[PDB]
Ligand binder design. Structure first.
Ligand code: ADP
Ligand code: ZN
Lengths: 70, 50, 73, 252, 286, 287, 76, 191
């Protein structure tokens, strides 16, 4: 059921996705990204993303409305 | 994980920099691009921590 | 009834803009039904690209209530 | 007949414009990274039948307004200042009208007219033909008049620049014309560039003067790049004219 | 040659509904329909299907019906709604193929030059891979057959597409499954493997007991082509093959011996990290 | 005359016809009819789904000639049986699966002809390989906006399957229509073959992959597993007394002991065991 | 005279008309029994589209013939 | 105006290749098909016509359709070559007309036999009582040569419509070379 639970999260991408860049991380599962819309946010991240991919200031995807790390 | 799908359909938060605070539990913050705002503090934070 | 309907959807407040250039796209080879759209390749005439006053470029295949001959870039 | 015009306008009303953007790269078979011209970047998809091989890094597409997906790949922009100097010259009597300098009339013919009409003789000796020339002299000797008779032959493939309306009020945006010019000169293959009176944009050098001079010199060095630089040129000829050649940059 | 076909999972289900349409007769009524696919490559694709009326008797299997007029109009509709798609062949639902099944192919080779059948099975009593497909050639024999015409086995597999994997595997939630389980599928795979081995041997001796004694044509088919099967039969435990298991299995034993030697140390980290966290949260609480 | 707790039965062929027509016509609304039977006054059952030739825009979609319509149903009667239209469907690509202002305009057209005409919404974009976002709605009058519309004699269509989503009640629920529940009926015959379509023959169960690459893969994986052990000695010994949520913030980055170390052992286990055990059976069984 | 309007919902609608009547008057009568406006109505007689500018005698539609009623289907 | 489904059984065996009718039997039996399709059209457009042959294969060139222009395309290059085959020729018309679209239409079969049949009387009486069990009326028109002064045919028609039947008839041949309109002078209505 936990592996069925991981797959059902994945509707959140669905490709109308916008692109930001990763900046910093505060604590467990909460970080800061710099969007390509000019401004700067304080977002939440999914438990799915492997944490080895972080800090090159990586290119990241973001939600449109709710603006989280996806 | 099952609860999580609603919580990330929820709006984010801005980040800004405190210039300096003033009286009556307010500060003065330029955000990133825009002007400076006189805003409210939370109930969990203190004025002296700013 | 139509000239009444033209009056309604042609209001006064407008956004002005610039005609950047003009084009003419051809049709394609295959258009299967079910997913058939007239916008894709059912028009072979003229077409234009427009930048607004808000620094935003737009593509429109249907020109509007003007003539493509009278338009220059 | 007037009813037919109204029915065309009934069809015309429900058309919705489309977003213009450029393809950055291909992520997967159905995921694409594009960028709107005004700003931010997106992750998109095509429809089904768009012939996705033609989508390359650097091409231009049209996007849906709401679904925000790729509709059609399109050719390259033109920046209609170029259209204001491409199809703008009116015709002229040919060089039988001019006279008294038939040496220089012949001399221009080998650098422009011959190596595109007859490229074989240059390959036989084995020497690349020259690229650009320079006209100079007192005013009223007919420097502008000579270029009109050359332009009156082609009348389709001739770019004329005043070399003074290039400047602007912004910081970039004067180089951005020059990149668009040579790229338009890249697309059509046998192009002719004509810039009268370089002395506005030309100059020589200043020992760290006004920042406004630095805008001119950075604009000047885009020419010194894109005449020699990395990318070589083919069939691109540049006619240059001025009154005083002493004030010019020796690198030019 | 075609050398495999690719069957999307929208069909194998758009056949069984048509078996469920006329299935109220219960006893026997074979479903025959029209198959739709892609003129792709040497490899071929299968996308869509539809039905066609068909009936046939029990004796004198030469009385059968394919409405050409129904086949012209309804394919003319599917050509109208879909220009990408054209015909590739046909199917029937019969568990074992019948004697009638060659003249049906000989009809519709005038539609596609290589018209291919697909046999499906609504009831796979075999728990193995169903829905196998054939193609007809000519193999004129030493006996003097004017045209030795019999179908040839072609391998096949179930296709996949991004939209249909969504809809199918949503419907798999009515039962439980371990696709994520490593080595739990694997142990079943040799169980599902050797069950297939025993099933083919019980079938072949039933053919072999009949042709030995009393009644069957003893013909110069399988009886020596199956003799070649006995010719291979490797002699496994002999002179130098012993030095293939004692030089190569003990290679793979060391890697397992390495992997256990770390897995025990990894689980030993979780002891001390828990035993520190146990008593030191206790001794500060008290 | 009153409503109830209604229930939308399906066919398994229908949902695959729903999304594949929806996915292939993704950037616009694609339309189709829905074909079934009114089994009682309480539940509804669709068994068939077909589309029609269409013509669309970016904002609207239209059908074309109705001579396709009656001739389609005619040739579905003579092959199989006759049946009944029950409603229709279309897509809302990437939207909040909600009846639009034109989508509602074709419903007083349909509810006046037959009573319980169901509008069905599908989205092949918010649907992942785990689960599908299917949706079906039922128009209600505005003249009975004060009077009750359902008698509510059970709990099955009140608190089950969700409370209505915030992006769908912003247009709809419970104004101008009401939602309806959807389940999945399954005949035994297709249920048995929907179970087994990911298995192979005994050829796949009895392979021995190849011993050159299998030793090469073991030579590969152990080699970086040495390097993972090099990094593992440093970090476990290190342990700055940092109250380990601060250990849990300095590890997002490039840091990865203890995570690949469990991983590659699992790969080296399941590869070597099956490669041995299948080679065991090919001697015991064969000759 | 009587006619028959057969829907795709298996429903038969009978209408008392005249052979000289226009099609839009028949579509008005369908609106009189249903409330469906005539722009949302399509009429098929023997695989043929019917036009409001003609009459029933133009298509040789006579007493107790069978029509086919298809509704407008635009969403969006 | 009445509701039926015309199933015509043409003859392209070899015995049609002679001239005991005036041009050739082929044009003689084609003109018989010309007058019956106009008969079924002017009766009722709801009626429909399908054809079958009695050759080595019993070929459905047209499945049952109300349009007759397709049938007239099939009658050209009919190739009158082959063996007459009878016991499966009714059987392929038997199971064909249970796949009709209008079940109010009566299953009526007409047959054109212009070749000698080698049938047994036992094989046809099995077919005759088979047609009793499904209530099919067949009117056979005889051409040319066959078992002359027809035996096992009048016996077949009578054992088709026995026990208060007489909806099925047997129009024998007029043994004379003449136009096909004189052949259909009595069957212009029925047998
Ligand atoms: N060689 C010549 N023959 C005839 N007319 C000439 C000649 N040279 C100059 N002119 C006259 O000069 C005018 C153009 O001069 P222009 O080309 O502008 O000189 P410059 O380019 O040096 O300023 C023409 O109108 C023409 O009448
Ligand atoms: Zn909509």
């Amino acid at each position: 059921e936990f592996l069925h639970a991981q797959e059902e999260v994945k509707r959140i991408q669905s490709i109308p996705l916008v692109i930001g860049q990763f900046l910093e991380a505060v604590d467990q599962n909460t970080a800061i990204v710099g969007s390509t819309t000019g401004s700067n946010y304080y977002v939440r991240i999914l438990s799915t993303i492997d944490r080895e991919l972080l800090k090159p200031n990586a290119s990241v995807a973001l939600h449109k409305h709710s603006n989280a790390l996806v | 994980l099952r609860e999580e799908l609603q919580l990330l359909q929820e709006q984010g938060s801005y980040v800004g920099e405190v210039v300096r605070a003033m009286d009556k539990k307010k500060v003065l913050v330029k955000v990133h691009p825009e002007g400076k705002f006189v805003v409210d503090v939370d109930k969990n934070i203190d004025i002296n921590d700013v | 009834e139509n000239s009444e309907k033209i009056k309604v959807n042609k209001t006064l407040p407008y956004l002005v803009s610039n005609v950047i250039e003009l084009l003419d796209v051809d049709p394609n080879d295959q258009e299967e039904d079910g997913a058939n759209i007239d916008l894709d390749s059912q028009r072979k005439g003229k077409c234009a690209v427009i930048k607004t006053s808000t620094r935003q470029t737009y593509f429109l295949p249907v020109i509007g209530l003007v003539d493509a001959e009278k338009l220059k870039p | 007949k007037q009813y037919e015009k109204s029915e065309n306008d009934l069809k015309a009303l429900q058309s919705v414009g489309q977003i213009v953007g450029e393809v950055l790269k291909q992520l997967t078979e159905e995921k694409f990274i594009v960028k709107a011209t005004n700003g931010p970047r997106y992750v998109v998809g095509c429809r089904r039948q768009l012939d996705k091989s033609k989508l390359k890094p650097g091409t231009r597409v049209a996007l849906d307004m709401t679904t925000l997906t790729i509709m059609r790949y399109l050719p390259r922009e033109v920046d209609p200042l170029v259209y204001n100097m491409s199809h703008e010259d009116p015709g002229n009597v040919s060089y039988s009208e001019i006279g008294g300098l038939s040496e220089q009339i012949r001399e221009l013919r080998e650098v422009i007219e011959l190596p595109l009409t007859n490229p074989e003789l240059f390959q036989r000796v084995g020497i690349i033909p020259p690229k650009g020339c320079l006209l100079y002299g007192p005013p009223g000797t007919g420097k502008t008049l000579l270029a009109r008779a050359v332009a009156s032959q082609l009348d389709c493939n001739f770019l004329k620049v005043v070399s003074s309306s290039i400047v602007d009020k912004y910081i970039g945006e004067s180089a951005r014309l020059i990149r668009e010019m040579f790229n338009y000169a890249r697309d059509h293959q046998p192009c002719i560039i004509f810039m009268d009176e370089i002395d506005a944009i030309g100059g020589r050098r200043f020992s760290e003067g006004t920042s406004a001079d630095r805008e001119i010199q950075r604009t000047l060095m885009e020419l010194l790049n894109q005449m020699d630089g990395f990318d070589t040129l083919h069939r691109v000829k540049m006619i240059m004219a001025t009154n005083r050649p002493d004030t010019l940059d020796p690198a030019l | 040659a075609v050398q495999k076909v690719v069957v999307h999972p929208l069909v194998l289900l758009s056949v069984v509904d048509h078996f469920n349409r006329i299935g109220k007769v219960g006893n026997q009524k074979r479903v025959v329909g029209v198959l739709l696919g892609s003129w792709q490559k040497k490899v071929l694709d299968v996308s869509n299907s539809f039905a066609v009326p068909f009936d046939e008797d029990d004796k004198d299997d030469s009385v059968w019906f394919l409405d050409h007029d129904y086949l012209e109009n309804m394919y003319g509709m599917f050509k109208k709604v879909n220009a990408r798609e054209r015909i590739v062949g046909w199917y029937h639902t019969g568990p074992k193929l019948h004697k009638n099944d060659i003249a049906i192919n000989e009809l519709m080779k005038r539609y596609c030059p290589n018209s291919v059948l697909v046999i499906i099975d609504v009831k796979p009593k075999d728990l193995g891979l169903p829905t196998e497909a054939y193609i007809s050639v000519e193999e004129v024999h030493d006996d003097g057959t004017p045209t030795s015409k019999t179908f040839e086995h072609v391998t096949s597999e179930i296709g996949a597409e991004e939209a249909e994997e969504v809809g199918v595997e949503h419907l798999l939630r009515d039962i439980k499954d371990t696709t994520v389980g490593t080595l739990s599928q694997r142990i079943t795979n040799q169980v599902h493997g050797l069950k297939g081995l025993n099933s083919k041997l019980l079938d072949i001796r039933s053919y072999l007991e009949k042709v030995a004694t009393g009644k069957l044509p003893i013909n110069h088919q399988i009886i020596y082509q199956l003799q070649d099967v006995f010719n291979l039969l490797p002699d496994v435990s002999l002179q130098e093959f012993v030095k293939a298991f004692y030089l190569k299995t003990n290679d793979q034993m060391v890697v397992v011996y390495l992997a256990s030697l770390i897995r025990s140390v990894v689980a030993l980290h979780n002891l001390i990290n828990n035993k520190i966290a146990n008593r030191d949260a206790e001794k500060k609480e008290g | 005359a009153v409503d109830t707790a209604e229930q939308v039965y399906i066919s398994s062929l229908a949902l695959l016809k729903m999304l594949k027509h929806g996915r292939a016509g993704v950037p616009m609304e694609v339309m189709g009819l829905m074909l079934g039977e009114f089994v009682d006054d309480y539940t509804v059952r669709v068994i068939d789904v077909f589309a029609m030739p269409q013509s669309g825009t970016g904002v609207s979609v239209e059908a074309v000639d109705p001579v396709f319509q009656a001739k389609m149903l005619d040739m579905l009667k003579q092959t199989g049986r006759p049946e009944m239209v029950v409603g229709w469907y279309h897509s809302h690509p990437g939207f909040g699966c909600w009846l639009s202002g034109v989508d509602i305009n074709t419903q007083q057209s349909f509810e006046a002809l037959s009573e319980r005409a169901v509008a069905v919404v599908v989205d092949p974009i918010q649907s992942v390989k785990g689960k599908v976002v299917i949706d079906a709605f039922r128009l209600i009058n505005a003249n009975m906006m004060v009077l009750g519309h359902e008698p509510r004699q059970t709990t099955s269509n009140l608190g089950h399957l969700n409370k209505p989503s915030i992006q769908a009640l912003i247009h709809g629920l419970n104004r101008h229509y009401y939602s309806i529940t959807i389940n999945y009926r399954k005949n035994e015959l297709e249920q048995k073959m929907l179970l087994n379509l990911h298995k192979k023959s005994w050829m796949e169960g009895l392979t021995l992959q190849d011993y050159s690459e299998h030793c090469k893969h073991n030579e590969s994986v152990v080699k970086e597993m040495l390097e993972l052990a090099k990094n593992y000695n440093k970090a476990v010994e290190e342990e700055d007394k940092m109250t380990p949520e601060q250990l849990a913030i300095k590890n997002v980055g490039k840091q990865d002991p203890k995570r690949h170390l469990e991983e590659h052992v699992d790969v080296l286990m399941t590869s070597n065991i099956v490669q041995c055990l299948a080679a065991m059976l090919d001697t015991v069984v064969f000759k | 005279m009587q006619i028959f309007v057969k829907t795709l919902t298996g429903k038969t609608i009978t209408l008392e008309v005249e052979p000289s009547d226009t099609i839009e008057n028949v579509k008005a009568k369908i609106q009189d029994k249903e409330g469906i406006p005539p722009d949302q109505q399509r009429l098929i007689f023997a695989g043929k589209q019917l036009e409001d500018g003609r009459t029933l005698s133009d298509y040789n539609i006579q007493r107790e013939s069978t029509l086919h009623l298809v509704l407008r289907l635009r969403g969006g | 105006m009445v509701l039926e489904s015309t199933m015509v059984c043409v003859d392209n065996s070899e015995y049609m290749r002679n001239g005991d009718f005036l041009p050739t039997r082929l044009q003689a039996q084609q003109d018989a098909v010309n007058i019956v399709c106009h008969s079924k059209t002017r009766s009722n457009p709801e009626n429909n016509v399908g054809l079958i042959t009695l050759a080595n294969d019993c070929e459905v060139l047209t499945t049952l359709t109300p349009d007759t222009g397709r049938i007239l395309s099939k009658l050209h290059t009919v190739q009158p070559k082959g063996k007459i085959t009878f016991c499966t020729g009714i059987r392929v018309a038997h199971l064909a007309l249970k796949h009709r679209q209008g079940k109010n239409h009566k299953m009526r079969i007409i047959a054109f036999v212009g070749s000698p049949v080698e049938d047994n009387e036992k094989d046809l009486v099995k077919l005759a009582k088979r047609l009793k069990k499904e209530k099919v009326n067949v009117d056979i028109i005889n051409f040319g040569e066959e078992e002359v002064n027809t035996e096992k045919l009048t016996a077949f028609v009578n054992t088709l419509n026995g026990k208060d039947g007489t909806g099925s008839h047997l129009v024998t041949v007029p043994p004379g070379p003449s136009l096909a309109d004189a052949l259909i002078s009595s069957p212009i209505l029925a047998g």
